[PDB]
Design an enzyme around this catalytic site. Structure first.
Site, PDB file in Angstrom:
ATOM      1  N   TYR A  38       1.035  -1.236  -0.031  1.00 38.91           N
ATOM      2  CA  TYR A  38      -0.215   0.122  -0.374  1.00 38.91           C
ATOM      3  C   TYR A  38       1.135   1.605  -0.176  1.00 38.91           C
ATOM      4  O   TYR A  38       2.241   1.291   0.185  1.00 38.91           O
ATOM      5  CB  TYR A  38      -1.067   0.091   1.378  1.00 38.91           C
ATOM      6  CG  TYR A  38      -2.036  -0.723   1.155  1.00 38.91           C
ATOM      7  CD1 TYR A  38      -2.927  -1.017   0.622  1.00 38.91           C
ATOM      8  CD2 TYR A  38      -1.792  -1.801   1.920  1.00 38.91           C
ATOM      9  CE1 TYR A  38      -3.948  -1.308   0.606  1.00 38.91           C
ATOM     10  CE2 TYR A  38      -2.690  -2.956   2.613  1.00 38.91           C
ATOM     11  CZ  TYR A  38      -3.558  -3.260   1.180  1.00 38.91           C
ATOM     12  OH  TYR A  38      -4.972  -3.419   1.635  1.00 38.91           O
ATOM     13  N   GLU A  58      -5.236   3.754  -2.669  1.00 43.15           N
ATOM     14  CA  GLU A  58      -6.291   3.176  -1.758  1.00 43.15           C
ATOM     15  C   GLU A  58      -4.637   3.356  -0.302  1.00 43.15           C
ATOM     16  O   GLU A  58      -4.149   2.558  -1.288  1.00 43.15           O
ATOM     17  CB  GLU A  58      -6.858   1.847  -1.760  1.00 43.15           C
ATOM     18  CG  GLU A  58      -6.771   0.227  -2.214  1.00 43.15           C
ATOM     19  CD  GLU A  58      -7.014  -0.718  -2.081  1.00 43.15           C
ATOM     20  OE1 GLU A  58      -7.880  -0.979  -0.546  1.00 43.15           O
ATOM     21  OE2 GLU A  58      -7.065  -1.330  -2.510  1.00 43.15           O
ATOM     22  N   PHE A 100     -15.941  -4.119  -1.631  1.00 39.85           N
ATOM     23  CA  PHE A 100     -16.014  -2.978  -0.363  1.00 39.85           C
ATOM     24  C   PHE A 100     -17.308  -1.905  -0.930  1.00 39.85           C
ATOM     25  O   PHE A 100     -18.359  -2.369  -1.540  1.00 39.85           O
ATOM     26  CB  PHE A 100     -15.119  -1.547  -0.747  1.00 39.85           C
ATOM     27  CG  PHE A 100     -13.832  -2.190  -0.582  1.00 39.85           C
ATOM     28  CD1 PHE A 100     -12.770  -1.737   0.225  1.00 39.85           C
ATOM     29  CD2 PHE A 100     -12.839  -2.213  -1.813  1.00 39.85           C
ATOM     30  CE1 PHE A 100     -10.970  -1.820   0.435  1.00 39.85           C
ATOM     31  CE2 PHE A 100     -11.865  -1.915  -1.694  1.00 39.85           C
ATOM     32  CZ  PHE A 100     -11.039  -2.315  -0.026  1.00 39.85           C
TER      33      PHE A 100
END
Ligand SMILES: Nc1nc2c(ncn2[C@@H]2O[C@H](CO)[C@@H](OP(=O)(O)O)[C@H]2O)c(=O)[nH]1
Ligand SMILES: Nc1nc2c(ncn2[C@@H]2O[C@H](CO)[C@@H](O)[C@H]2O)c(=O)[nH]1
Ligand SMILES: [Ca+2]
Length: 104
Positions: A38, A58, A100
């Protein structure tokens, strides 16, 4: 009151700003953290109605209030674009599998 409620996790605008700033600096430096690397691109497979343009990235936002540094990212994430504009806050809580839903 929570500015973003992800499942049972409550986040204020300041929590989001702090997480986004960390995610964006790593993005700018071309670095990543965690075994899922990430921040990484968020494809928007879900088709959320973001008001800022793509590409999106993200980055995990944690209910402990700490900035993500590796290890389990939990279910929540801040989604920012190339211009460091916040797209939204989403979470895997209340979504099946690895899909999500947006934080409310
Ligand atoms: N559902 C979902 N995940 C995506 C998309 N863009 C990238 N991914 C990544 O795919 C992986 C499998 O959904 C997720 O890992 P995560 O478990 O660590 O969030 C997530 O990072 C997207 O648009 N929707
Ligand atoms: N806590 C939590 N993690 C989830 C969920 N769905 C997927 N995960 C993933 O499971 C791992 C541990 O949180 C991370 O990869 C998460 O992204 C969820 O609903 N809750
Ligand atoms: Ca907080």
């Amino acid at each position: 009151a929570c500015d973003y409620t992800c499942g049972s996790n409550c986040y204020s605008s300041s929590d989001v700003s702090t997480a986004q700033a960390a995610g964006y600096k790593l993005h700018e430096d071309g670095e990543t953290v965690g075994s899922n690397s990430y921040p990484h691109k968020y494809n928007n497979y879900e088709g959320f109605d973001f008001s800022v343009s793509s590409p999106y990235y993200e980055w995990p936002i944690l209910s402990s209030g700490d900035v993500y540094s590796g290890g389990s990212p939990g279910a929540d994430r801040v989604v920012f674009n190339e211009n460091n504009q916040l797209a939204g806050v989403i979470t895997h809580t209340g979504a099946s599998g690895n899909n999500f839903v947006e934080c409310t």
